Ligand binder design. Structure first.
Ligand SMILES: CO[C@@H]1O[C@@H](C)[C@@H](O)[C@@H](O)[C@@H]1O
Ligand SMILES: CO[C@@H]1O[C@@H](C)[C@@H](O)[C@@H](O)[C@@H]1O
Ligand SMILES: [Ca+2]
Ligand SMILES: [Ca+2]
Ligand SMILES: [Ca+2]
Ligand SMILES: [Ca+2]
Ligand SMILES: [Cl-]
Lengths: 111, 112
C-alpha cells in the first residue's frame, strides 16, 4: 500500500471522491505499522476509510468489511451530539469518531 | 521509486495539474522507456503527460520548467496543429501526441 495525503480539508464524501478519482480509497490502517505510516503522511487530523454509518457502533471500511484493528483515543468512539459516524486519525495517531459532514484532510491508499 | 496512478474522468491540463497536486504528486513525466511503459500499464485510454512547449514553441519542458530529454513522439508529431498544441498526451500505443492544453483527457499522476 502507498499512502498520500491531501493538502486541503474536505468532508468525507469529497474525500472518498478524491481517492476514488485516482482509483484508490480513503486509507484504512489494518495494523499499528500502517497506522503510523498514515499518521506520518498526514500533517494534521485526517479522515480514515472507516464508518459506522450502516450500523451504529459497528465500524467497517468503505467496502463493508468490518475492521479488526482499531486505535481509539481514550473516550472514543463516543458518537456525540446528533452522531459521529466517520473516523479521523489524530496527530498522535489515535482515532476519533466525528460527523461525516465535517472537514478534515484525507489520506488516500493505493495498492 | 515512482508510482503512477490514472484518473477515472477526463479533464484539461490545468485541472489535471490540480488533481495530482491535491495529493502532492505531479502529472506523470516519463524519463525513459521503462517509465513510459509503466504509465502505459495504468492508462486505459489517451492520457496527459506533464510536458508542454508553452514557454517556447517546440521546446518541451516538464511542468516545473525543466527541459525534457527523453521523448517518444508518434510519427508525424509534434505537429502543433491549428491555433496550437502545447500539451502532450500518451497515446494507447505508448507514443506521444502534442494536443491543445484545453482539450480533455485522462491524467496519470506520479508520486515518489
Ligand atoms: C467530547 O467529544 C470530543 O470532542 C468533540 C469536540 C469532538 O471532537 C468529538 O468527536 C470528541 O469525541
Ligand atoms: C493530424 O493531426 C493529428 O490528428 C489530430 C486529430 C490531432 O489529434 C493532432 O494532435 C494530431 O497530430
Ligand atoms: Ca456513530
Ligand atoms: Ca468522538
Ligand atoms: Ca506547441
Ligand atoms: Ca499533434
Ligand atoms: Cl456522521
Amino acid at each position: 500500500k502507498y499512502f498520500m495525503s491531501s493538502v486541503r480539508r474536505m468532508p468525507l464524501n469529497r474525500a472518498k471522491a478524491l481517492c476514488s478519482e485516482l482509483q484508490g480509497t480513503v486509507a484504512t490502517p489494518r495494523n499499528a505499522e500502517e497506522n503510523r505510516a498514515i499518521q506520518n503522511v498526514a500533517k494534521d487530523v485526517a479522515f480514515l476509510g472507516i464508518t459506522d454509518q450502516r450500523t451504529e457502533n459497528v465500524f467497517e471500511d468503505l467496502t463493508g468489511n468490518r475492521v479488526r484493528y482499531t486505535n481509539w483515543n481514550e473516550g472514543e468512539p463516543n458518537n456525540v451530539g446528533s452522531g459521529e459516524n466517520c473516523v479521523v486519525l489524530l496527530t498522535n495517531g489515535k482515532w476519533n469518531d466525528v460527523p461525516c459532514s465535517d472537514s478534515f484532510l484525507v489520506v488516500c491508499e493505493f495498492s
